[PDB]
Amino acid sequence: ELVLALYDYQEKSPAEVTMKKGDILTLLNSTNKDWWKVEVNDRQGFVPAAYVKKLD
């Protein structure tokens, strides 16, 4: 499913990935309530679950 980046986020750890507000990301894993794995363009990593909104 797709998610919308509500805020920009700069990765701060190896598992994280950076995104820009307005970006449309592919949701890969939402099993964690605080961090969701997403694919941003061609990169994959975690971003705060609260910073994205499911479109589906």
Swiss-Prot record:
Q: What residue stretches are annotated with the SH3 domain?
A: 1-56
Organism superkingdom: Eukaryota
Localization per record = Cytoplasm, Cytoskeleton; Cytoplasm, Cell cortex
The record's family statement is: Belongs to the spectrin family.
Q: What is the recorded function of this protein according to its Swiss-Prot or TrEMBL entry? A: Morphologically, spectrin-like proteins appear to be related to spectrin, showing a flexible rod-like structure. They can bind actin but seem to differ in their calmodulin-binding activity. In nonerythroid tissues, spectrins, in association with some other proteins, may play an important role in membrane organization.
Subunit structure and binding partners = Like erythrocyte spectrin, the spectrin-like proteins are capable of forming dimers which can further associate to tetramers. Interacts with ACP1.
What is this protein called in UniProt? Spectrin alpha chain, non-erythrocytic 1
Provide the species name: Gallus gallus
| Coverage span on the entire protein | 970 to 1025 of 2477
